Ligand SMILES: *[C@@H]1O[C@H](CO)[C@@H](O[C@@H]2O[C@H](CO)[C@@H](O)[C@H](O)[C@H]2NC(C)=O)[C@H](O)[C@H]1NC(C)=O
């Protein structure tokens with residue numbers, strides 16, 4: 001998820017691993033976490049200028065050749081350097097199951113593709129116009145035009161709406177993509193604007209917040225304040241960020257966020273930013289009932305019901321009725337059930353940091369001072 005930076009995180013079923021460019025070394029990457037493939041597969045002496053991560057893989061932009069070099073255990077992302085030839089790339093961005101690479105000016109041809117992408121349902125060349133930056137969602141990638149600074153997205157739009165609902169006309173300084181939404185900092189005034197049919201935008205942007213950079217998970221978004229350089233995170237199923245430590249940059253996994261401290265002496269910190277819950281779909285609509293929800297199901301809160309309800313329509317015929325959704329069975333890799341499924345909420349998951357002894361190699365989301 002997100003864009004290229006000095007730090008990156010892999011996430012998903014294979015574990016959670018934080019990779020960072022060591023400035024004390026020759027811009028060589030060093031990783032740690034539960035995604036063992038993304039730790040020990042890292043190139044041991046390949047100088048890199050940037051990093052980006054996805055579901056079980058991390059890709060770096062080489063210094064020498066300025067081409068993508070990927071490692072990890074994602075079946076849709078090839079290990080090593082993809083079939084590029086002579087092209088060179090300005091930036092990288094990794095989604096769940098795909099990598100996108102913004103071509104350098106020297107490798108760009110007029111009226112031709114600006115981005116090369118590899119991955120599931122994403123392998124090909126895209127936007128036929130120069131872009132400044134690129135960012136990747138779960139199943140899509142976005143970018144800002146060099147001409148008018150307006151955003152454009154490509155890929156699978158299902159569940160997000162980020163391609164058609166893109167604010168073509170607003171000019172952005174930078175944009176970051178979450179799992180099903182995109183947030184950006186406006187060029188004029190540096191306000192934060194987001195789009196995409198996601199519960200990460202259920203409450204909206206924190207009032208009066210000016211950020212320098214943004215990162216986003218599946219259903220959450222974090223930002224660094226302009227002055228204090230302190231993190232401010234919001235979104236779905238988010239618990240009440242480290243308030244003390246200022247950061248120079250952030251990076252977001254699917255359900256955790258890591259930050260490179262502004263002070264180079266202090267080590268990296270990571271914290272959980274939520275957990276997945278079963279939500280009603282077209283195929284699994286959920287039971288509208290006037291009575292409390294039966295065992296094994298929970299009453300979806302009225303706030304999210306209104307958010308998931310179409311324009312000018314109620315989700316259940318009788319608005320007072322409870323919408324009962326099946327309780328989630330289990331937690332994703334690295335997390336364990338912290339709270340049981342009640343009649344009012346789904347089961348809550350937290351990252352299992354109990355097996356973090358010496359030479360245990362636990363999740364990257366468990367690293368605090
Ligand atoms: C911003 O600039 C881009 C690139 O110059 C524009 O994208 C092109 O717009 C023309 C005119 O509609 C289309 O014929 C092309 O197919 C577009 N190219 C691509 C790759 O999509 C974009 O329309 C401009 N937007 C604004 C608001 O100025």
Ligand SMILES: *[C@@H]1O[C@H](CO[C@@H]2O[C@@H](C)[C@@H](O)[C@@H](O)[C@@H]2O)[C@@H](O)[C@H](O)[C@H]1NC(C)=O
Pocket residue numbers: 121155156157158
């Ligand atoms: C692969 O991604 C597709 C996205 O395609 C885009 O949206 C559709 C509606 C068309 O306008 C197409 O030209 C666009 O490129 C998804 O529609 C499709 O379901 C995805 N397939 C799988 C197997 O995930």
Ligand SMILES: *[C@@H]1O[C@H](CO)[C@@H](O)[C@H](O)[C@H]1NC(C)=O
Pocket residue numbers: 284285286287297324325326
């Ligand atoms: C729970 O799942 C079963 C089987 O997948 C389905 O038939 C049922 O409708 C679901 N219950 C609710 C309340 O959605």
